Amino acid sequence: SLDTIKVGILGYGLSGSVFHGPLLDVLDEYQISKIMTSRTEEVKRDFPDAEVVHELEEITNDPAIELVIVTTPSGLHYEHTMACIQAGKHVVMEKPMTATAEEGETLKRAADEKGVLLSVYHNRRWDNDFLTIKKLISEGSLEDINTYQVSYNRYRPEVQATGTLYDLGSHIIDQTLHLFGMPKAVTANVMAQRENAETVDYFHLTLDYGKLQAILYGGSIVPANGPRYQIHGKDSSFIKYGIDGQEDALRAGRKPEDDSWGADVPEFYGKLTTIRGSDKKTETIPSVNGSYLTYYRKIAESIREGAALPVTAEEGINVIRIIEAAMESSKEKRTIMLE
Amino acid sequence: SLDTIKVGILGYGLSGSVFHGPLLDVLDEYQISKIMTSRTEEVKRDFPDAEVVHELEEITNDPAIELVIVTTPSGLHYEHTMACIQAGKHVVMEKPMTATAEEGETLKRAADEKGVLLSVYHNRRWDNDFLTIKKLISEGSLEDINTYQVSYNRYRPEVATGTLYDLGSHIIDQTLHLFGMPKAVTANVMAQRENAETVDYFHLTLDYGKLQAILYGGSIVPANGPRYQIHGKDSSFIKYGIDGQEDALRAGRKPEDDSWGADVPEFYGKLTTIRGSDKKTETIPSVNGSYLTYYRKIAESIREGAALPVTAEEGINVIRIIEAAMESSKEKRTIMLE
């Protein structure tokens, strides 16, 4: 194929080698050409045909390179992204996009100025549970949602853009923005519960959409999780436990190769309750398979065909906007309204 | 028995006739003597030996009456309560105690000056689920609770009033009973329903520092999540369902045997405990709910000088939490408690 998109991957830690590499590897739309890393042997074993490089320029000055994936650590990655944009490369950034909305806008304007595609890897829009929710919404089984409550907890009692609101909160904020647009206000408590904690490990956010209230919360001393989603509309409620299995499959060295990729466990299928007049019906909904590949098939369609991006820089920046307003709400102890 | 506590009941609507009358009726420590209502025929069927009266003074100026249950509507009940206190009567008030904490303080002060017992019927302290939670805590099975989330929802899509006073007061009282007063309250209190003129949704955060207590409920909720999600250093308790006693009372049943207030097995809660790497979940059979316990204690207070099952001060604190929440919702900011 003359038309493979030539990819350079920045960094080959966990994101590069586990979350991106294996997905890019199964899509013939793509060719992994270069990877910036000192893990020379790992790359030789994972991608025999890739070239290892140790300088950013070896990617930014290479005219054959069309798309750069930025997985370098939170600090140095703004620099790297700008450098890629300056060199006329399309760029996929990890979440959370940046620490501040202002940094994010700067990248967006530089990309627009330069005619390049800038996206943010908010791949939890292709988690099984979330896909299931979008399917229920589109089929009219979850009308006029009035309450949307999402929890994202862990049990990590020992302390091992920092903290869990950036790292985990960003995913469920993106989902919320995706579903309902921007809220008119944010009220939040953002803290460190754990004994010697440096960074945020607890958040509770309320996104004010008037009649609709979106509540997003997460703790780090939570032996057992309640439901991940509790969603209430005029006629029905969707309540579901569990988390998407794709990241664990990827950590176990598995690749997407058949239709059973991203399947949910039957015990974790959501329950939809519907009330028509006097009758109350409860149904177990088999989850739509999770499909992280979809983000990359769409990126390929933006690059080659000019189709709209699967996640846009603006949507990425909006997540950061909610995160900063939450921090500000927590610090000032008041509701932060948004224009 | 020469020693029955002689009861006067004010009002014979739902509270009087369904939630108090039938409990007092099975306890031989009490005699229902007088009921102030216009429902004369109804009292005649239910309590053939009670006297019906039509003015308050027929109860307050009767030297034999020792205890008065105030079930008259929220508005006229501050007035009613004060007269009972002024006449030297012990009083049980329905929840919520009063619209404002200031009103509750006045009632308490007059009770203390007059030397009578003043209590509030926060009977949810004896719901099956909450008794089970309390038992877990006392056995050391929920140590160092860091998160306590309680939901109190209903599906009423068609329209001291509103659900914060009516429902939220129950789960607030439980929270205060477990943990004391928090440092701050942050709340949103509104009407979500299209034609609502009164509160029908609340979401409160009580700030205890590391511990966060979240109390909420809406009125357009087809299926509830857990009523309780409680997380501590080693363990979590998650539980669905509501205590069945009030429904039994509505259907006309009375406490008669050991089966009263039993929870349904499918709504038993789950305790998850983590021991280093070993995580285990155990189903916890619920302790039976026991509203009678409230009234047995009241009788021990009156006859033996025991401490009240719910004090006026506790009742007032519930109201202080409610006012701080309304104020937080209006000012769109966190309200610090004094």
From Swiss-Prot, chain A:
Disruption phenotype: Cells lacking this gene show normal growth on SI as well as on glucose or myo-inositol (MI) as the sole carbon source. Its EC number is 1.1.1.371. Induction: Is constitutively expressed, even in the absence of both myo-inositol and scillo-inositol. Is up-regulated under certain stressful conditions. One of its GO terms (biological process) is antibiotic biosynthetic process. It catalyses: scyllo-inositol + NADP(+) = scyllo-inosose + NADPH + H(+). Pfam families: GFO_IDH_MocA (PF01408), GFO_IDH_MocA_C (PF02894). SUPFAM superfamilies: NAD(P)-binding Rossmann-fold domains (SSF51735). It comes from Bacillus subtilis (strain 168). Catalyzes the reversible NADPH-dependent reduction of scyllo-inosose (SIS) to scyllo-inositol (SI). Cannot use NADH instead of NADPH. May be involved in reduction of not only SIS but also various oxidized compounds manifested upon stressful conditions. One of its GO terms (cellular component) is cytosol. This is scyllo-inositol 2-dehydrogenase (NADP(+)) IolW. Belongs to the Gfo/Idh/MocA family. One of its GO terms (molecular function) is NADP+ binding. The keyword Oxidoreductase applies.
